[PDB]
């Protein structure tokens, strides 16, 4: 019994970041990398299944990305993931959610897991597309925005609750194997902030440059830019006077 | 050309984002001759023809599939068939929980353009140009769709303005393609949790986010809210952790604070999904030690200071 958890190492930007010369991306000098927040919850859900079962459950994390990603993978192993796999070649640079979905699917075909988990979305790009793209290439049952999972290893159905707008959930019975995208709050990840990573090339999974990268993506980046955004009226000075202004705002309100 | 819009309904009610999409479609199109086709999918979806017989709709297609409300297998097959029938240049879906279940699957199978959570769309000549966010909304990413005869976009809710007035679409009925879904919808659920206060009704809110740190810090903000005559609300990390009831959560998956005139956002970064719940509030104060927090881009007043230092001084002064 195996659960495959697709994970992304996301980039967050430092203050005073700049757009790079080509105008196509932010300058990498301003990026800080860490595991996608949704992936903490997905991984913990796989581990909960592993702990609840007398039967062995192999938890495999997989990421498509350059060598910086190994740090995040190493940390997943330390939290109890059984195996970690990084897929990359330089030709994969600029692969969108749908191409990433393709690449992940080539690993998954070989791993032949019983369930696939992915995050609802990435904190950086927030495509909310990658996991459901994987479901398409696998031609598997799927559900997005899963807030609860009732599933025993080997079962041919699961019961999930999707988290809807406006404070409601929906129970859905879904055939397994399935792809689920996992929402914040499904569980309380346990480790909240020398087995190696398995390194896989595009060749290892039957792909080449012509299958991946920006040329195969479903849209083309024209530019990336810092838009003019709304500006608050900033209250400077001491805490006493900042609080004094708040109270005046409250009083003006009533 | 045709622009295809996929409407959305749940629990017998049309979701208003449906009309924002029609507004977007009508704005987007290149000539008066182009047509907007709206589809509504459901086993009981004829019920929605009145609410979708509105300004800007040229054709209205009722698709009867196997499920009452959203099913990803039914929707994907149905929307694929609509695209075949209407050969739309652009297909507009809402960037909603339902759409997240299928939109990227629909685009994986086919040679369609695709982008999600789009908040600017226009034609430059014959070229469709869409803008979405990058790096947790710190940049705009402007994209196009070279050589794509059909582009599928999911559209950010509450950005595009609906049209006013009735309309007189040509109404048709089609059956969805006949394939068995791999899932079955069961109960809707409103989970447990206190509900002493309907936060859609209240006019003064102090809201706390992850910046409060540990649960032991909630009490002092509850006391502040009480001393101020505000209702204590939160962002999702706080409710997910069980520190306040889900009935107090503000945003897309929580509630919209429709009656709120003053919202004090403390230790909340201003994620899109939080903003969905409170961006309309006529006076927002943000108190946050990160000047680059998204919340400052909608706040009237910003204070870049420690929330505990501000809370204690506010309490003293009050
Ligand atoms: C489908 C979906 C639906 C969602 N629905 C909702 C929803 O309904 N509501 C919602 O809230 N979220 C929703 N989200 C979650 C959302 O993406 C974010 O995870 C969330 O809003 C972040 O909450 P936060 O701002 O409290 O936390 P963070 O983004 O971590 O922000 C914490 C803030 O605290 C500040 N801070 C830290 N220490 C201090 C200090 N001492 N003094 C002052 N400031 C401090 C930081 O600078 C930071 O800006 C949804 C997400 C998805 C994908
Ligand atoms: N490069 C990647 N490698 C592995 N999984 C990924 C990658 N990119 C996205 N994902 C998965 O998709 C989710 C993020 O969603 P999205 O916003 O569509 O990228 C993550 O939590 C992962 O489960």
Swiss-Prot record, chain A:
Keywords: Electron transport, Nucleotide-binding, Transport. It comes from the Bacteria. The keyword Transport applies. It holds the Pfam family ETF. AMP binds at residues 6, 36-39, 64, 119-122, 127-130. One of its GO terms (molecular function) is nucleotide binding. InterPro entries: ET-Flavoprotein_bsu_CS, ETF_a/b_N, ETF_b, ETF_beta_N, Rossmann-like_a/b/a_fold. Heterodimeric electron transfer flavoprotein that accepts electrons from trimethylamine dehydrogenase. It transfers the electrons to the main respiratory chain via ETF-ubiquinone oxidoreductase (ETF dehydrogenase). EtfB binds an AMP molecule that probably has a purely structural role. Belongs to the ETF beta-subunit/FixA family. Heterodimer of an alpha and a beta subunit. Forms a ternary complex with trimethylamine dehydrogenase. This is Electron transfer flavoprotein subunit beta. It comes from Methylophilus methylotrophus (Bacterium W3A1). The gene is etfB.
Curated annotation (Swiss-Prot), chain B:
Signal peptide: none annotated. Its cofactor is FAD. The keyword Ubl conjugation does not apply. The keyword Amino-acid biosynthesis does not apply. CDD domains: ETF_alpha (cd01715). Keywords: Electron transport, FAD, Flavoprotein, Transport. Binds 1 FAD per dimer. InterPro entries: DHS-like_NAD/FAD-binding_dom (IPR029035), ETF_a/b_N (IPR014730), ETF_a/FixB (IPR001308), ETF_alpha_N (IPR033947), ETF_asu_C (IPR014731), ETF_asu_C_CS (IPR018206), Rossmann-like_a/b/a_fold (IPR014729). One of its GO terms (biological process) is fatty acid beta-oxidation using acyl-CoA dehydrogenase. It comes from the Bacteria. FAD binds at residues 210, 235-236, 249-250, 253-254, 269, 271, 273-274, 288, 306-307. One of its GO terms (molecular function) is electron transfer activity. Heterodimer of an alpha and a beta subunit. Forms a ternary complex with trimethylamine dehydrogenase. Heterodimeric electron transfer flavoprotein that accepts electrons from trimethylamine dehydrogenase. It transfers the electrons to the main respiratory chain via ETF-ubiquinone oxidoreductase (ETF dehydrogenase). Belongs to the ETF alpha-subunit/FixB family. This is Electron transfer flavoprotein subunit alpha. It comes from Methylophilus methylotrophus. The gene is etfA.
